[PDB]
Amino acid sequence: TTVTSYPGVYIEELNSLALSVSNSATAVPVFAVDEQNQYISEDNAIRINSWMDYLNLIGNFNNEDKLDVSVRAYFANGGGYCYLVKTTSLEKIIPTLDDVTLLVAAGEDIKTTVDVLCQPGKGLFAVFDGPETELTINGAEEAKQAYTATPFAAVYYPWLKADWANIDIPPSAVMAGVYASVDLSRGVWKAPANVALKGGLEPKFLVTDELQGEYNTGRAINMIRNFSNTGTTVWGARTLEDKDNWRYVPVRRLFNSVERDIKRAMSFAMFEPNNQPTWERVRAAISNYLYSLWQQGGLAGSKEEDAYFVQIGKGITMTQEQIDAGQMIVKVGLAAVRPAEFIILQFTQDVEQR
Amino acid sequence: AAVYYPWLKADWANIDIPPSAVMAGVYASVDLSRGVWKAPANVALKGGLEPKFLVTDELQGEYNTGRAINMIRNFSNTGTTVWGARTLEDKDNWRYVPVRRLFNSVERDIKRAMSFAMFEPNNQPTWERVRAAISNYLYSLWQQGGLAGSKEEDAYFVQIGKGITMTQEQIDAGQMIVKVGLAAVRPAEFIILQFTQDVEQR
Amino acid sequence: TTVTSYPGVYIEELNSLALSVSNSATAVPVFAVDEQNQYISEDNAIRINS
C-alpha cells in the first residue's frame, strides 16, 4: 500500500467501493426507416431530438411518406429522442449503440432482423405493427401465423388514420411514443395500455369486443380500441408469448430496465477482488435499488423479505472453485406486478355470511 | 509474465508507444493507491494516449484464454482502460497478476526480515519470535482485505517447531523450515447475474 | 449453462417452470346442420357468434 522512505507527512486517501445504481433512459426507441428514403445516410444512426430538430433534415413533405408521418406521430404522443437507421444495416448498428431499448418497426417488415438481434441477455424489447388489412374473427388462425412467438415483441392491430398526412400511420410508431410517455409519467412497471392517444388520430378499423376475444390469447395481438369515455385508447398489455412467466409488456420491460441499470453499476465493481468486504457493498447497493422500486409500488408483496432477495457469498450462491476461476455470482429475485387484465366483480346477497 | 495487445498511439511523440512501459506505470500507481492485491486492470490511463487498434469484444473472447493476452480496451464511461489481469499461465493456482504479485511482495518482505534472524540459534525462544513476527504481517494483510476467508484461522497459517515442520536431524544440519499459507484474493473477472421471478422460493 | 469467455458482466435469467391451469370454454357446442341446407359450405366449420 504505502511506502515510507523519507521523514515527513504522508497523505494517502483510502476509499471504500462506492456503488450506486442509476436509472435512466427507460424507453428510447430506434426507427427502422424505409429503404427508399434517400435522406437517411447509409449505415449511420442519425439521431434526432425533437420535430424542429428533425425538420432540419427535411424541411417539407410531412404529408406522404410513411416514415415521415410516423416520426411526426411519434413526437406528438410522447417525448423522446430516437435514432434513425436503414433496415438494410439494422443488425450492424444496434449492437454498437448506447441506449436502444425499443427496436420499433415503422411499417417495414423486419421480423427476421429482430429475432437475430435480441438474445435473452441483451434486452431491447421490440414492438411490431399489426397487419394493415382486415382481420375477421374466423380467420384468426391464419393471421397469427405470420408472427413467431417470442417474449420480446408486441403487435398492435388497427393501423391508424389521421387528419393530417392522409396516408395510413403504422401503429407501432404511435405506440412507441406512448411507451416513453407512460414510463416517464408513471414509471416502467405500469402497463402501457389504457392511455388515450394525445395525437388527433383515430383507428382506421373499428374493433368489435368479440373480435378481441379470440385474438387476445395465444401469441396475442393487442388492439387499439376507441370508446366514448376516453377516446381512442390502447387496450392491450400482452406480449407475443402465452405462458405464466412473461405474459405482459410491463412484466417484460421491468426485467429489461432492472437488468440494464444494474449492469451499468457492475462496470464500476468490475475488477474488484471478491471477498467479504467487496460483495457486501454489491449486495447493499443492489438491495437499495430493489427497495426503492418496492416503495414506489413496482414490486408486489407485503414486506421487503417477500418482494425481492439478493444473495452473494462464498457458500450460498457460488462455491470455492468458482472463486478460483474468478467469477462471482449474484442471484436477484423480483416479484413484478402484473396489470389487472380482467377485473371481475362477484355480487352476493349474503352479507351476514361474509 | 503478462502481455498487453494494442500498441498505444499518443498526440505528442507521434511514434507508437509500446504498451508494456505504459502498463508499468499503472502497476506502481495501483500498488501505491489500493495495494498490491488489487488487480491492475480497470484503471483509466492518465496520459492522453489512445489505443492504435480498436478492440472487438468477440476478439477478446478467444484471446483471453490459454496463455492469455490482456487487451487494452477503450469504452465511453472511463476512457481507455486496461482490461486484463491474467498472466501468461492457464492453471488454477497462478492465473492472475494480482495473485502472482502478492506472492512476490510477501516473499520479499519476509526475506528481508529473515536476514535479521539469520544466524540466531534455533530453539523454542527463537522460532516463537519468528512465528509471531511473520503472523503479524499476515494478519495486517487480512485486516486490509488482501486475504480471503472469514476468520484468521482460515486466511493464513504459519508453522515452525521441532516436530511439526522439521525433524530433529534437520536441526542438526542447521536448517529451520517455515511453512506459510496464503489465500490471496482473485479479481472478479466474470461477474454474472442470475435473475429469478421466484421470490418466496429463495 | 453459461459460458464465460471475455471479462465482462453476464446477465442470464434462469426461471423455474411456471405452471398454471386455465379454465375456459366449458360448453361450446357444434351443430350438425341438415344436409339439404345449401347455405353451409361443404366441409368447413363456419363459426357464428350471435
Q: In A327-345, which positions are buried (b, 16+ CB within 10 angstroms) versus exposed (e)?
A: bbbbbbbbbbbebeeeeee
Min distance B84 CA to chain C CA atoms (Å): 8
Question: What does the DSSP 8-state code read for residue A311?
Answer: E
Of A239, A90, A71, A80, nearest in space to A156 by CA: A239
CA gap B110, B152 in Å, rounded: 19
Give Cα A147 distance to the centre of its chain: 19
Min distance A259 CA to chain B CA atoms (Å): 8
- Contact across the interface for B145 and A277, Cβ inside 8 Å: yes
Q: B190: which chain C residues are within 8 Å (Cβ-Cβ)? A: 4, 7-8, 10
H or E segment and range at residue A160: strand A160-161
Min distance B76 CA to chain C CA atoms (Å): 15
Q: B73: which chain C residues are within 8 Å (Cβ-Cβ)? A: none
Query: Which three cell numbers, joined as nine digits, stand for A317?
Result: 450462491
Give Cα B48 distance to the centre of its chain: 27
Reduced to 3 states (helix: H, G, I; strand: E, B; else coil), residue A292 is helix
CA gap B60, A353 in Å, rounded: 69
CA gap A83, A86 in Å, rounded: 10
Q: In C6-29, which positions are buried (b, 16+ CB within 10 angstroms) versus exposed (e)?
A: bbbbbbebebeeeeeeeeeeeeee
Cα A258–A259–A261 angle (5° rounding)?
60
Q: C16: which chain B residues are within 8 Å (Cβ-Cβ)? A: 196-198, 201
Q: C13: which chain A residues are within 8 Å (Cβ-Cβ)? A: 120, 255, 259
Subunits with 3+ C-beta pairs closer than 8 A to B: A, C
- Contact across the interface for C7 and A138, Cβ inside 8 Å: no
C-alpha distances in Å from residue B109, one per residue of A45, A96, A307, B24, B36? 56, 47, 50, 21, 13
- Contact across the interface for A307 and B187, Cβ inside 8 Å: no
The residue of chain A nearest to residue B95, with distances taken between CA atoms, is A325
- Contact across the interface for C9 and A244, Cβ inside 8 Å: no
B135 contacts: CB under 8 Å, gap ≥ 6:
B156, B158
Min distance C9 CA to chain A CA atoms (Å): 7
Q: What is the largest CA-CA distance in chain A?
A: 91
The residue of chain A nearest to residue C20, with distances taken between CA atoms, is A244
- Taking CB atoms within 8 Å and a gap of at least 24, the contacts of A277-285 are A277/A16, A277/A17, A277/B145, A278/A17, A278/B145, A278/B188, A279/A312, A279/A313, A279/A328, A281/A16, A281/A17, A281/A19, A282/A17, A282/A19, A282/A312, A282/A330, A283/A310, A283/A311, A283/A312, A285/A19, A285/A20, A285/A21
Q: Where are the alpha helices (DSSP H) in C1-50?
A: none
Residue numbers followed by a gap, chain B, C–N over 2.5 Å: none
Pairing of strands B72-75, B79-82: antiparallel
CA atoms within 13 A on the CB side of B1: 8
- Contact across the interface for A273 and B198, Cβ inside 8 Å: no
Q: Contact A42/A52 with Cβ under 8 angstroms?
A: no
Of A276, A255, A249, nearest in space to A338 by CA: A249
Whole-angstrom distance between the N-terminal and C-terminal Cα of chain B?
A: 43
Of A64, A38, A68, nearest in space to A55 by CA: A68
Query: Which three cell numbers, joined as nine digits, stand for A133?
Result: 388489412
- Contact across the interface for C4 and A327, Cβ inside 8 Å: yes
C43 contacts: CB under 8 Å, gap ≥ 6:
none
CA gap B4, B55 in Å, rounded: 12
C-alpha distances in Å from residue A225, one per residue of A188, A208, A338? 22, 9, 21
Phi, psi of A329 (to 5 degrees): -115, 130
Reduced to 3 states (helix: H, G, I; strand: E, B; else coil), residue C3 is coil
A203 contacts: CB under 8 Å, gap ≥ 6:
A158, A159, A160, A161, A224, A225, A226, A232
Pairing of strands A231-234, A224-227: antiparallel
Query: Which three cell numbers, joined as nine digits, stand for A310?
Result: 439478493
Q: Contact A182/A192 with Cβ under 8 angstroms?
A: yes
CA gap A267, A19 in Å, rounded: 10
A-B interface: how many C-beta pairs under 8 angstroms?
122
Of A94, A85, A89, nearest in space to A117 by CA: A94
- Centre a 10 Å sphere on the Cβ of residue A151 and count the other Cβ atoms it contains: 22
Whole-angstrom distance between the N-terminal and C-terminal Cα of chain C?
A: 52
Phi, psi of A331 (to 5 degrees): -100, 125
Min distance A3 CA to chain B CA atoms (Å): 8
CA gap B5, B68 in Å, rounded: 10
Crossing angle of helices A278-295 and A249-265, in 10° steps, is 150
B6 contacts: CB under 8 Å, gap ≥ 6:
B19, B51, B52, B53, B54, B55, B71, B72
The residue of chain B nearest to residue A264, with distances taken between CA atoms, is B77
Q: A317: which chain B residues are within 8 Å (Cβ-Cβ)? A: 194
Which resolution in angstroms does this entry have?
A: 3.7
Chain C residues in contact with chain A using a Cβ-Cβ cutoff of 8 Å: 4, 7-13, 15, 18-20, 46-47, 49-50
What is the DSSP track for chain B?
---B-SPEE-SSS-SPBPHHHHHHHHHHHHHHHT-SSS-S-S-B-SSS-EESS---TTTTTTTSSSS--B-EEEETTTEEEE---B-S--SSSS-BHHHHHHHHHHHHHHHHHTTTTSS---STTHHHHHHHHHHHHHHHHHHTT-B-SSSHHHHEEEE-SBTTTB-HHHHHTT----EEEE-B--B-SEEEEEEES-TTT-
Phi, psi of A318 (to 5 degrees): -125, 150
Residue numbers followed by a gap, chain C, C–N over 2.5 Å: none
Question: What does the DSSP 8-state code read for residue A41?
Answer: P
